Give the backbone structure.
Amino acid sequence: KSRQLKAAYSIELAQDLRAVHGMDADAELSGILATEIMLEINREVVDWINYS
Amino acid sequence: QINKWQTAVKSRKLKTGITVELAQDLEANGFDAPNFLEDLLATEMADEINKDILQSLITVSKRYKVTGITDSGFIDLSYASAPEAGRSLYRMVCEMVSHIQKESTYTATFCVASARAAAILAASGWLKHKPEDDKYLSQNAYGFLANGLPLYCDTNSPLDYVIVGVVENIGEKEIVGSIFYAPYTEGLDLDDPEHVGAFKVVVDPESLQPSIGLLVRYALSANPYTVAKDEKEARIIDGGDMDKMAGRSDLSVLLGVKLPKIII
Amino acid sequence: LQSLITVSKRYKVTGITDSGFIDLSYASAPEAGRSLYRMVCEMVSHIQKESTYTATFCVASARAAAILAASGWLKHKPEDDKYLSQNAYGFLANGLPLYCDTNSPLDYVIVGVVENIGEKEIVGSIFYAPYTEGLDLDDPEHVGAFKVVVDPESLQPSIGLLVRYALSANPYTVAKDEKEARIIDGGDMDKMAGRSDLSVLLGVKLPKIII
Amino acid sequence: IKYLNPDNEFTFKTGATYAGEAGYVDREQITELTEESKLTLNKGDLFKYNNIVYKVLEDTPFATIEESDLELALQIAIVLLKVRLFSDAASTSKFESSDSEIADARF
Amino acid sequence: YKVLEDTPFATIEESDLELALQIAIVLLKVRLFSDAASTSKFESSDSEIADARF
Amino acid sequence: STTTNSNSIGRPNLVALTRATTKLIYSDIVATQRTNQPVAAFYG
């Protein structure tokens, strides 16, 4: 079974963040998607343990 | 007292895209298709930037209303007694310059006019092209005036007029003028940053022809000491907001010109 | 010169140039030249507005050039001949060199452009563009070539020359028939005449010289 | 070789901008001036003439302009600060909604 | 000269034919005919070549 | 009698390419400096 997420950010934002905060505004966002997915998977396993 | 004039940067965006078969035809026909395309967007955008600045200038500059001959917001110039038609405009150019020098303290370093307004001013004499003096015309001026200002042409706005105003740069931070443009590129990864703005390419997912566009961002703000005649006294002033700032500025002065129509 | 006259757009203003020409008297001395200098300036900025090009030359009939000279603001001053190419009557305050026609029966003033932006970007009202390739020429800068025949009855010599050229109109010029087309005949003055964004003509009305 | 705006006119002859607040599709919503429509305008309204987008600064622009030639009446409205040229850059959000229109460049 | 618009001089009130003609050029009724020949004019095997004289 | 009414032309010579563009005069109109933030604020 699969599991997936999308970010969809603007160009103008990415430029503004690099100028204002220094954040890449790509990696800090793709990092969330990847983190959220791995976290949800890890929960799924714990939840199946408590379920079963 | 120290006040600030603040604006956000605003954006401009163009899109072209050339069908693969058409792009191939451009090469076949003697054109550099990939450079043609980038030059097209860059050119059209630069053209729109120029139009924006000139049109914004028209709407920011103060009106030179005089009880004697300009209380219409423009000067009426005929063909009778021909040298007078240009010389009575030259006089307005000089008076507008002095008005700026007195009210803003700046020297009013340029003069810009419509194609016909520029011609009628040139017709006065007291204007010279003098290729030997091209060094100080930036290869842009029509020519220059006896009073020292270069004369530039607009040609884009539907107005027929003459504006005088200032561009000065003392150094480091002491930069003054009517409208600052002030482009924003920080954070944008550029090949030769002097370009300003950037290109993006996508390519359609159905038709597979390429697609390309260009993004530019800038402030185009008003100068310090200018406050719309609404608030009058403010500490934080929106340097944009042309709906209130329009027509109220001491770094540039406008006088329109009334001429007989061109027969088409 | 004649091709330029019949291609250039006519300058007409309700104020002083209707009917296609400006009427200039001897009253108020310099005014006659001044009211023409102004026409030169207006026609010049008109071209920039409509074509983006700078209207780099001015040509006039011999008399029209004199009328213009009467205003002052036209100078020969030999020390400055560098920019007249030994041809111009003199230079104007507005930066254009003034050349004389001296030949056509028209009495007028034309402003227009000749520019060279490099390699291919050759721009201007009329391109002349002679065709010499294929002719083995004695002095390749001659343009065209000579032939000698000699008669078959008498044996006297017979000499002549043939020259060939395009004389093309400039792009963005379209006859007021098609108005917009993908292929435009760059010649055919019968249709192209009076149409051009790169040159503007104003005639001049003067009293006659007594013969 | 000519560079054209979205209405396929020479960019250097039209005098209008498109890649900004005026937009291109937006011109299909902006009212043109007519001998009657000039009288229904108030502060904040947009209108167009010869594809240039204009904005009203003062309620009932043309209230005091006796000029019958609409083109000149408009030039007067610009001079008298009743109407301002609307050409300007867009608020950044204009192109971020994804429900966006980018003015075309043509040739 | 060559006629661009039929009935040239229809709207030229000038009585001096020479000036009326200058007006016709200005008004684009008539064009100066100086022009180059079609190439075929000289390859006919029977053609007139303008004389040069001195 | 071969003449130009017999011979054909494969391709014309372009001779020249002209592109009419606006002369952009704004650098002589506006006093500039670049902005390195999404917002600029000038001091008077």
About this structure: Strands of chain F lie at 39-43. Chain F is about 0% helix and 10% strand. The interface with chain E takes residues 1, 3-5 of chain F (CB under 8 Å).
